[PDB]
Amino acid sequence: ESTMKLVTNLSGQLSELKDQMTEQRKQKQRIGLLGHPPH
Amino acid sequence: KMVYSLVSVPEGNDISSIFELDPTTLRGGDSLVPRNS
């Protein structure tokens, strides 16, 4: 179960980089769409 | 050729007075900005 450290960290990082790129896309959902509508 | 210069404006709702912070050293986009960085 101390070997579960490396077993679960690979899962944690593989989940989290996808989560952070999805969160970057979500940040785009706001920042890009803020400057798109005209005046 | 400096096309743009910084001035003072009384109006606030315009988007022309919107800025972004770029750290000197790369940092994540979901991190708390330190007070003196």
UniProtKB/Swiss-Prot annotation, chain A:
It is found in: Endoplasmic reticulum membrane; Cytoplasmic vesicle, Secretory vesicle membrane; Cytoplasm, Perinuclear region. It comes from Rattus norvegicus. Residues 21-39 are annotated as: Disordered. It comes from the Eukaryota. Inositol 1,4,5-trisphosphate-gated calcium channel that, upon inositol 1,4,5-trisphosphate binding, mediates calcium release from the endoplasmic reticulum (ER). Undergoes conformational changes upon ligand binding, suggesting structural flexibility that allows the channel to switch from a closed state, capable of interacting with its ligands such as 1,4,5-trisphosphate and calcium, to an open state, capable of transferring calcium ions across the ER membrane. Cytoplasmic calcium released from the ER triggers apoptosis by the activation of CAMK2 complex. The gene is Itpr1. Polyubiquitinated. Polyubiquitination targets ITPR1 for proteasomal degradation. Approximately 40% of the ITPR1-associated ubiquitin is monoubiquitin, and polyubiquitins are both 'Lys-48'- and 'Lys-63'-linked. This is Inositol 1,4,5-trisphosphate-gated calcium channel ITPR1. The ITPR1 structure has a large solenoid CY assembly built around the central helical bundle made of the C-terminal domains from four ITPR1 subunits. The solenoid scaffold includes domains responsible for binding of ligands and regulatory proteins and is connected via an allosteric nexus at the cytosolic-membrane interface to the transmembrane channel assembly. Six transmembrane helices from each subunit form the central ion-conduction pore. Belongs to the InsP3 receptor family. The chain holds residues 2703 to 2741 of 2750 of the full protein. Homotetramer. Homodimer. Interacts with ERP44 in a pH-, redox state- and calcium-dependent manner which results in the inhibition the calcium channel activity. The strength of this interaction inversely correlates with calcium concentration. Part of cGMP kinase signaling complex at least composed of ACTA2/alpha-actin, CNN1/calponin H1, PLN/phospholamban, PRKG1 and ITPR1. Interacts with IRAG1. Interacts with CABP1 (via N-terminus). Interacts with TESPA1.
